[PDB]
Amino acid sequence: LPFERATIM
Amino acid sequence: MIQRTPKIQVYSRHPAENGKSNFLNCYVSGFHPSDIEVDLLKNGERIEKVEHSDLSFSKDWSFYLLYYTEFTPTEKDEYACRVNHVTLSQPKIVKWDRDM
């Protein structure tokens, strides 16, 4: 299962 | 930009035996950026129904893909892989060799 948060770079 | 040219290997899934159905593979690797064109050839002609693996990459960030198709090797049909990439002036052809 992948990491749940996306964070803009 | 730093660009890396692909390595190319052409080979069969199983030991090659004339008149026995098998798979013809062309593995491209160590390249960057990811856009690439790969065809499989039978006596110079583009094979139609070729499939390929999903785009992934190695620990050094370079991309790799497997292209493959069903085929029946014979004593005298010639097989090859044709590759083009931004790093290459004109396409590269690598011939299928049974001992390679």
Binding site: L1, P2, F3, E4, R5, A6, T7, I8, M9 | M1, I2, R4, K7, Q9, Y11, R13, H14, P15, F23, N25, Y27, S29, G30, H32, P33, S34, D35, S53, D54, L55, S56, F57, K59, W61, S62, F63, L66, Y68, D99
Partner: protein
């Protein structure tokens, strides 16, 4: 019995040819098990190994939500990084990301990983402590500052020590017949004259899994490192991998040469010779 899980993200801009393409793939060891492609006719997480197919609709929907959000997030990141480097709107660029967790043979977390790259160059990486970042340049420091403000490392650490490990161990149990089965290489040695006075000995390894293997030639029981032609390990297409190693030897010193094979699948390391 050491195992790992990794996800691999590639985001690629293509000015004049639509919005950037985002694709995620997931692996356990050398086995891919899921994909998502923002270009696919209907973008959704799809299974790529039989043992994942048993997961329910809530798994598939959950994955698809995350990858859809990542598609949009990475589109902004591409815009941001082009700015950080003062780059023109005309060229195509790539952000890559790889992350996941390693387990030891006991099933306990050996270590976590999270690394990103830009145009194939290291950009930002989570340090092994899972609490701090290594930024490659002044552009990456801007990303580092954004990521500290959102408490990213803290979120990664909870994931890598928690869910990542728990799901890896689930996959390993559900796919145990393949994921925890090592297939040893089938091996032989071939001999081909190159000239009257020299021949090629080629040591072949086929049908093995996982991909990790060591193939070496020796002359009188010493390593022939600089003289061995060593081909990159390659996928057969049926889950298994292939490799060979070759040496050019004087005729007929052939019997002074030995091929050595190490692989997790084997009862014992192998020593092979050309058998005329």
């Amino acid at each position: 019995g050491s195992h790992s899980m990794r996800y691999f993200y590639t985001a690629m801009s293509r000015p004049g040819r639509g919005e950037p393409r985002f694709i995620a793939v997931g692996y356990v060891d050398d086995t891919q098990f899921v994909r998502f492609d923002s270009d696919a006719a209907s973008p959704r997480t799809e299974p790529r190994a039989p043992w994942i197919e048993q997961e329910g609709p809530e798994y598939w929907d959950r994955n698809t939500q995350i990858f859809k959000t990542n598609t949009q997030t990475y589109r902004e990141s591409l815009r941001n990084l082009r700015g950080y480097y003062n780059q023109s709107e005309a060229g195509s660029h790539i952000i890559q990301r790889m992350y996941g967790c390693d387990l030891g043979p006991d099933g306990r977390l050996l270590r976590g990983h999270d690394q990103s790259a830009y145009d194939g160059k290291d950009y930002i990486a989570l340090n092994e402590d899972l609490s701090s970042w290594t930024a490659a340049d002044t552009a990456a420091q801007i990303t580092q500052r954004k990521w500290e403000a959102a408490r990213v490392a803290e979120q990664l650490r909870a994931y890598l020590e928690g869910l990542c490990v728990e799901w890896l161990r689930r996959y390993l149990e559900n796919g145990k017949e393949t994921l925890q089965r090592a297939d040893p290489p089938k091996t032989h040695v071939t001999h081909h004259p190159v000239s009257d006075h020299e021949a090629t000995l080629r040591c072949w390894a086929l049908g093995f899994y996982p991909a990790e293997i060591t193939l070496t030639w020796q002359r009188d029981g010493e390593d022939q490192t600089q003289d061995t032609e060593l081909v990159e390990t390659r996928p057969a297409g049926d889950r298994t991998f292939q490799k060979w190693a070759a040496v050019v030897v004087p005729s007929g010193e052939e019997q002074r040469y030995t091929c050595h094979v190490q692989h997790e699948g084997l009862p014992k390391p192998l020593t092979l010779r050309w058998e005329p």
